[PDB]
Write a protein that binds this ligand. Structure first.
Ligand SMILES: CN(C)Cc1ccn2c1[nH]c(=O)c1c(Cl)cccc12
Length: 115
């Protein structure tokens, strides 16, 4: 069916709020987070990040209908943001963008608390 259940609609709304967020200059902060590069590209990344995560992984899990609740999706986004803030320096743009998208995530979930 093309009709999503209420839980599926809520998962999709959360995912899309993070994906689609743009700053005041029109930059889509999710860009860098869509797909993690390889070991070759980020030498230290897979040696230092225990549980790699990107938005394509979350999206595919969502599309396979494998998230049972909203907390489960939020957990994977929070993992991704913690990973970004572990690998990257606090002065880096990626670290700053992770912090903004984390707020988008939490604000979106809270604004759907009644739904
Ligand atoms: C270019 N550079 C130093 C880092 C870089 C470039 C790509 N990505 C990162 N760092 C990340 O942690 C990261 C995460 Cl969570 C998810 C997806 C992509 C990421």
């Amino acid at each position: 069916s093309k009709y999503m259940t209420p839980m599926q609609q809520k998962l999709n709304e959360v995912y899309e709020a993070v994906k689609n967020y743009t700053d005041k200059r029109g930059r889509r902060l999710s860009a860098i987070f869509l797909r993690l590069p390889s070991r070759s590209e980020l030498p230290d990344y897979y040696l230092t990040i225990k549980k790699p995560m990107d938005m394509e992984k979350i999206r595919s899990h969502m599309m396979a209908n494998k998230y049972q609740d909203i907390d489960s999706m939020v957990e994977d986004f929070v993992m991704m943001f913690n990973n970004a803030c572990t690998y990257n320096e606090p002065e880096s743009l990626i670290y700053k963008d992770a912090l903004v998208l984390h707020k988008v995530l939490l604000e979106t979930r809270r604004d759907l608390e009644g739904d």
